[PDB]
């Protein structure tokens, strides 16, 4: 095959994880410069979980209420000298800038886009994995209790683009959290109430990426001279649980390398969506949308 789930090296991000405690609640925080980010529900008492008043909880707090500890890497003695709420995140200020603060930005990630997650428990990095952000604004993650505040990010050279801070489990193995602007992905809210999720949808651009990988591996029985225009496909997509296809430079790279045009693969998706009719592609009977054009470019080819 040649394709695997590949995450970013996590060393840079490991060096920003801290444990945040408030009352008896403890979870993970992210230490950048003089600010420590964490989920606001660290404030929420167990008996308020199904209906927390976060305004009232925040009022109840002083700087003294919060404490931060660095458990791994360079040890540090921190003191919060400020506390504020940003949407569903807490934004604490501490008296010591993080000596290991990396160049970074805050980015909200889009459906179809892959990011790496650093799963942590009690301030200690425990594992990493990649997820693609689902079209229904959830992720299929791996998280237990104590994992909240675990962070997700992408990288641009050495610049780390932080995009996710883990918040909750919506159903079996389906999760969401906050972008660093404080907005919950999917607009789910941080209270323990049943909250229904939108129907999931194939990520069109990733399925196309995957078909390109097939062709690259010598599997192109699904490839016909026929094609569908992007616009044609896009209107069809709205009716068949497929996201709208937005072309990108790396997709165009695949089209060039394989000599196979995008629209041809969109026509292919029309056909395949119903079933492969006994056949396989690399080597499953289902469409695969968990690899991006950049994965294929990267892992199969030079870029």
């Amino acid at each position: 095959s040649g394709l695997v789930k590949m995450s970013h090296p996590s060393g840079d991000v490991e060096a920003c994880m801290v444990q945040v405690t408030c009352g008896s609640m403890t979870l993970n925080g992210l230490w950048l410069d003089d600010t420590v980010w964490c989920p606001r529900h660290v404030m929420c008492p167990a008996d308020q979980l199904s209906d927390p008043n976060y305004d009232a909880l925040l009022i109840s707090m002083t700087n003294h209420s919060f404490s931060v500890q660095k458990h791994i890497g360079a040890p540090a003695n921190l003191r919060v000298v400020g506390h504020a709420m940003q949407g569903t995140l807490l934004k604490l200020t501490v008296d010591v800038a993080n000596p290991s603060t990396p160049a970074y930005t805050f980015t909200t990630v889009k459906p179809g886009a892959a990011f790496s997650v650093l799963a942590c428990y009690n301030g200690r990095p425990t594992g990493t994995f990649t997820v693609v952000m689902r079209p229904n604004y959830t992720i299929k993650g791996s998280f237990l209790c104590g994992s909240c505040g675990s962070v997700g990010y992408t990288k641009e050279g050495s610049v780390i683009n932080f995009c996710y801070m883990h918040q909750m489990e919506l159903a079996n193995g389906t999760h969401t959290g906050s972008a660093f602007d404080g907005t919950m992905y999917g607009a789910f809210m941080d209270k323990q109430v049943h909250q229904v999720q939108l129907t999931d949808k194939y990520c069109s651009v990733n399925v196309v990426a995957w078909l390109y990988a097939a062709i690259l591996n010598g599997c192109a029985w699904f490839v016909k001279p026929n094609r569908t225009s992007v616009v044609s496909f896009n209107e069809w997509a709205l009716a068949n649980q497929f996201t709208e296809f937005v072309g990108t430079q790396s997709v165009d790279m695949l089209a060039v390398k394989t000599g196979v045009a995008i629209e041809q693969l969109l026509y292919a998706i029309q056909q395949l969506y119903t079933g492969f009719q006994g056949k396989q592609i690399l080597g499953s009977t289902m469409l695969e949308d968990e690899f991006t054009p950049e994965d294929v470019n990267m892992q199969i080819m030079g870029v």
């Binding site: 979980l49 909240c148 883990h166 909750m168 159903a171 789910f188 209270k191 323990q192 109430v193």
Partner: peptide, 5 residues
């Protein structure tokens, strides 16, 4: 049903 983590 949603579980705060």
């Amino acid at each position: 049903x949603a579980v705060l983590x």
